[PDB]
Design a protein around this ligand. Structure first.
Ligand SMILES: Cc1ccc([C@@H]2N[C@@H](C)[C@@H](O)[C@H]2O)cc1
Length: 438
């Protein structure tokens, strides 16, 4: 036991209603929108292959010159009601929005910096319009916030001098000012998802990360805070020096997921994965031919994979500079929504089922002991193997969409073949099991 002032504050999962809501939502969308959408990964005739939102770094653009992109910020096709409609039709239950990325441009009219939407031709409070429109559709809003800020010359990557320490202290005050402003201007916010907290400067000021968590929790009742914000007294991140999760949920599975056999430890805490459609582009990049682009079924597999292991999944969108979505993203959101409309009873408010993983897909468990089989890989044998935990038996199987009864055959003690449906559903599909405990 290492004594810590700024280590973990929760013991186990939060079970207050706000955390239950964060969890039951399960499926979210991410929006990365900022000045990087304007060049879209290209600078002065070179298209950079790195993530578009990092183009300032790839093209070595000085801050003043990068931030002059504000003069081009005029997304005339933006309509927050249309964005909220697209999210609703996709089946998302919440949206995480970049309030400010590393570049430091704010999507709300901050009084603490001139680098904001207010000082662009468009003028309007994008973040405020989104909060209202998403909330009008019943969709929760979460705020992404980058602590690292390339627009503020008080930022420091490490503290190597008295002057660095004074500057970084001013930087933390500026950061607190913005965070309090977000929390009070948009009091329906349900979560702060911090990024840009990996530098030595933040690791040496773990106390500040704990402070920011506590400050936001006092301002916004029931607010969630991600693990990535948090460093302990020793500079240890996400999990403290005693191995305890800091913040309210683990937020490290970013473009990767826990193994369904080897990583069952994740079922012990809340967690949220986020993923990009291309291999590694969050902000708008004009050239999606540069890396592999996931198909809708690949995305749906990841969504179900997360819920099957007790986690949420957030699918990223990088809107165009004009305020509309690219056709690949409109197609993705539509295809996800069509699937979720049909099969979402096996996703929303579901969790880890405690069954041995099988090759056909994933199990999820509903709030009333329903066990859903979500089938992604159709066996040529036309039999879906179900091995039940000790004392659990399968009483019935039903095809979710039609309610048709599915034959269940016991093959050995604790093992069944559940028949595939008489007609191949032609897409990933759900069979609902009625199970009984000894
Ligand atoms: C190494 C690395 C740094 C920052 C990131 C940022 N976090 C993602 C959620 C995006 O915002 C990406 O810019 C990703 C990888």
């Amino acid at each position: 036991e290492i004594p810590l002032k700024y280590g973990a504050t929760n013991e186990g999962k939060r079970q207050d209603p706000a955390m239950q809501k964060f969890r039951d939502n399960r499926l979210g969308a991410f929006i990365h929108w900022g000045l990087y959408a304007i060049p879209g990964g290209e600078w002065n005739g070179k298209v950079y292959g790195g993530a578009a939102e990092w183009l300032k770094s790839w093209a070595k653009v000085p801050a003043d010159e990068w931030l002059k992109l504000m003069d081009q910020w005029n997304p005339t096709k933006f309509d927050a009601k249309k964005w909220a409609k697209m999210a609703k039709e996709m089946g998302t239950k919440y949206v995480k929005i970049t309030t400010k990325h590393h570049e430091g441009f704010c999507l709300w009219p901050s009084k603490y910096t001139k680098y904001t939407v207010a000082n662009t031709p468009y003028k309007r409070d994008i973040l405020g319009e989104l909060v209202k429109a998403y909330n009008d559709e019943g969709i929760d809003v979460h705020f992404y916030f980058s602590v690292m800020d390339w627009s503020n010359p008080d930022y420091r990557y490490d503290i190597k001098s008295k002057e660095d320490s004074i500057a970084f202290s001013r930087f933390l005050e500026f950061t607190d000012n913005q965070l309090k402003e977000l929390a009070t201007r948009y009091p329906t916010v349900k979560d702060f998802w911090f990024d840009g907290t990996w530098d030595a400067s933040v690791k040496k000021n773990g106390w500040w990360t704990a402070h920011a968590e506590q400050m936001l929790k006092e301002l916004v009742p029931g607010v969630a805070i991600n693990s990535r914000l948090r460093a302990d007294d020793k500079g240890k991140r996400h999990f403290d020096s005693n191995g305890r999760l800091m913040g309210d949920y683990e937020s490290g599975y970013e473009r990767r997921l826990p193994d369904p056999v080897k990583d069952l430890k994740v079922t012990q805490w809340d967690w949220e994965a986020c993923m990009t459609i291309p291999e590694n582009q969050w902000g708008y990049h004009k050239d999606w031919s540069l890396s592999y682009v996931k198909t809708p079924i690949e995305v749906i597999d990841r969504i179900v994979h997360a819920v099957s292991m007790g986690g949420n999944m957030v699918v990223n969108f990088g809107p165009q500079a004009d305020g509309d979505f690219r056709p690949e993203e409109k197609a993705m959101a539509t295809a996800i929504g069509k699937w979720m409309n049909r099969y979402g009873k096996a996703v929303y408010a579901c969790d880890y089922a405690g069954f041995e993983k099988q090759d056909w897909g994933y199990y999820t468990r509903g709030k009333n002991d329903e066990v859903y089989m979500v089938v992604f890989n159709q066996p040529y044998s036309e039999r879906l193997i179900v091995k039940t935990p000790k004392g659990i038996t399968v009483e019935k199987a039903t095809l979710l969409t039609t309610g048709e009864d599915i034959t269940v055959v016991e093959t050995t003690r604790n093992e069944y073949n559940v028949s595939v449906p008489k007609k191949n559903p032609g897409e990933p599909y759900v069979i609902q099991l009625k199970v009984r405990a000894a």
